[PDB]
Amino acid sequence: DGTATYFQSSDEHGFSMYYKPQVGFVGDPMPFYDPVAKDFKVMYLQDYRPNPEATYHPIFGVATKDGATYESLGELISCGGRDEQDAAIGTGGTIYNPADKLYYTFYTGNKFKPSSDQNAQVVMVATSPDFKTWTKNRTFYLKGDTYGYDKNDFRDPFLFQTEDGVYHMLIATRKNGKGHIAEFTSADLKEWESAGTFMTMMWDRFYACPDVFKMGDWWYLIYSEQASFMRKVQYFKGRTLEDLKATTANDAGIWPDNREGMLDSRAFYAGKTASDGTNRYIWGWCPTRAGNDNGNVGDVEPEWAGNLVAQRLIQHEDGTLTLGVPDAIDRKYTSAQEVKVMAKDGNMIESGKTYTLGEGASVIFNRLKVHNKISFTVKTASNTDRFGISFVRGTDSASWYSIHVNADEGKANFEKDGDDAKYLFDNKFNIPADNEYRVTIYSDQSVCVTYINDQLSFTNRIYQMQKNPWSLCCYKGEITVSDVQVSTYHHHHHH
Ligand SMILES: OC[C@H]1O[C@@](CO)(OC[C@H]2O[C@@](CO)(OC[C@H]3O[C@@](CO)(OC[C@H]4O[C@](O)(CO)[C@@H](O)[C@@H]4O)[C@@H](O)[C@@H]3O)[C@@H](O)[C@@H]2O)[C@@H](O)[C@@H]1O
Numbered sequence: 219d220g221t222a223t224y225f226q227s228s229d230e231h232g233f234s235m236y237y238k239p240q241v242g243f244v245g246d247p248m249p250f251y252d253p254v255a256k257d258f259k260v261m262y263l264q265d266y267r268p269n270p271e272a273t274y275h276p277i278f279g280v281a282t283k284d285g286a287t288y289e290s291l292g293e294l295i296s297c298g299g300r301d302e303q304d305a306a307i308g309t310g311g312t313i314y315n316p317a318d319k320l321y322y323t324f325y326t327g328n329k330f331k332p333s334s335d336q337n338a339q340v341v342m343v344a345t346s347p348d349f350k351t352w353t354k355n356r357t358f359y360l361k362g363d364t365y366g367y368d369k370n371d372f373r374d375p376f377l378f379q380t381e382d383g384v385y386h387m388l389i390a391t392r393k394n395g396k397g398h399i400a401e402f403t404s405a406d407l408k409e410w411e412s413a414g415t416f417m418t419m420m421w422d423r424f425y426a427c428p429d430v431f432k433m434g435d436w437w438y439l440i441y442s443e444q445a446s447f448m449r450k451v452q453y454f455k456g457r458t459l460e461d462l463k464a465t466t467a468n469d470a471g472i473w474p475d476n477r478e479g480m481l482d483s484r485a486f487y488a489g490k491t492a493s494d495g496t497n498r499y500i501w502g503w504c505p506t507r508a509g510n511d512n513g514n515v516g517d518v519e520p521e522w523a524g525n526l527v528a529q530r531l532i533q534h535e536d537g538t539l540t541l542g543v544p545d546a547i548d549r550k551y552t553s554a555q556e557v558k559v560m561a562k563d564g565n566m567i568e569s570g571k572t573y574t575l576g577e578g579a580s581v582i583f584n585r586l587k588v589h590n591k592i593s594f595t596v597k598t599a600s601n602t603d604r605f606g607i608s609f610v611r612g613t614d615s616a617s618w619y620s621i622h623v624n625a626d627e628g629k630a631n632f633e634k635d636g637d638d639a640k641y642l643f644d645n646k647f648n649i650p651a652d653n654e655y656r657v658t659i660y661s662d663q664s665v666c667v668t669y670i671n672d673q674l675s676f677t678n679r680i681y682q683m684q685k686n687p688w689s690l691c692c693y694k695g696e697i698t699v700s701d702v703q704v705s706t707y708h709h710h711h712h713h
């Protein structure tokens with residue numbers, strides 16, 4: 219704690235709040251509020267590095283009351299045989315049927331090397347009375363082309379029941395080349411009728427992992443954009459279901475806010491929600507990086523799967539959504555640590571427990587631990603200033619990794635700083651009029667989420683942020699840093 223040199227830390231210690239199974243990684247999650255157990259069941263596609271040919275992504279599960287503590291459920295729905303329709307499983311959705319007291323999980327069966335007459339993707343279902351033993355329904359095969367949709371893109375079923383008792387299933391597919399979310403209705407979850415297109419997908423986009431829900435006086439669609447330049451979780455909103463569906467009708471592009479509904483950036487994907495009646499949370503995954511290299515974020519798309527991340531939905535008075543930390547996660551960080559300056563550079567002053575940094579100045583703080591909570595307040599002199607939050611920055615580090623907050627650009631960027639500096643990706647968010655940024659960062663080994671002013675929610679993979687110093691800097695203008703605090707998970711030091 220008295221040195222600030224770079225240390226080659228690892229993820230082997232283990233994750234807690236941003237869950238990873240002992241073997242493999244967390245792919246698309248399928249969260250569900252279990253109304254009998256009164257907790258969340260998060261099914262997810264289990265990823266291995268490498269996966270088998272043909273038979274991959276079985277559905278595993280974890281249980282959580284709150285998004286911070288997880289109990290593994292192991293393998294719940296296994297892959298089919300190499301030649302079967304669900305040789306590989308894709309994402310779906312779970313729902314409880316009070317009439318027969320069965321949990322139903324609809325999923326995507328991906329056929330290995332389909333023939334011209336076969337369907338690459340078909341929706342299938344499994345049921346369970348207790349969420350431990352699941353029985354595949356060997357007679358249920360929902361094919362898109364039966365209803366005018368696509369034979370090979372027909373996936374990610376989302377199930378919900380409306381107040382009138384009707385069950386709805388939304389499926390991401392195509393019709394005449396264009397992306398369509400198709401709707402099916404049922405009284406009993408067994409016999410399904412097509413209700414046509416729920417919503418079309420903007421332009422040539424494709425909305426994976428759709429999720430529709432009502433929260434307060436607004437209806438929402440949350441989705442994950444497949445297009446390579448986006449790869450982010452986004453949403454639309456409407457006061458009525460018809461208003462929601464109209465946001466994309468005829469490519470209207472009625473964005474819900476001033477940032478095209480982009481909730482997070484490229485290190486949080488496949489996000490879907492569930493509510494316990496008090497809060498609605500969103501679960502997605504944070505990708506791994508090839509070679510554990512924080513600056514290798516994929517040439518086209520990032521690696522698929524990684525760690526499970528939960529965030530809380532914040533509904534604003536105008537109906538827009540931002541994401542915040544789940545309250546139970548904010549409580550895993552218990553012992554406040556001492557914050558000490560280990561190095562200063564450039565044009566800056568230390569004034570007690572505040573710091574003023576001019577253009578080009580940096581301050582480096584003492585080493586973080588393994589699971590961290592970092593909080594501070596930044597006041598900039600102008601609404602065009604720029605400052606940085608840097609990790610893995612040892613006094614001897616040639617390069618490091620930073621969240622750049624660019625007020626003149628209306629966004630935060632994740633970048634590599636120092637030698638071989640390079641921009642990686644960004645995250646638009648509302649800039650405060652009073653130039654005050656209340657920052658909180660929650661980390662679990664290599665996974666962290668940065669929150670600012672209940673407006674920015676920025677997940678990042680930062681290998682080796684643990685057990686290494688962190689830093690604040692000013693790139694443009696002048697900033698004053700206040701109320702710096704750091705709290706930790708491990709804290710069991712008898713003194
Ligand atoms: O080729 C197999 C090989 O590819 C990976 C990703 O590198 O898995 C992709 C395949 O998984 C499948 C079935 O499990 O889909 C899973 C779900 O993923 C979703 C959203 O995350 O989208 C699939 C979509 O992901 C891409 O990688 C995006 O470009 C596409 O390849 C693909 O269309 C969701 O919509 C799916 O349900 C299967 O469909 C994918 O091809 C590896 O893990 C795997 O080993």
Ligand SMILES: [Zn+2]
Pocket residue numbers: 707708709710
């Ligand atoms: Zn401990």
Ligand SMILES: [Zn+2]
Pocket residue numbers: 231232588589707708
């Ligand atoms: Zn630990």
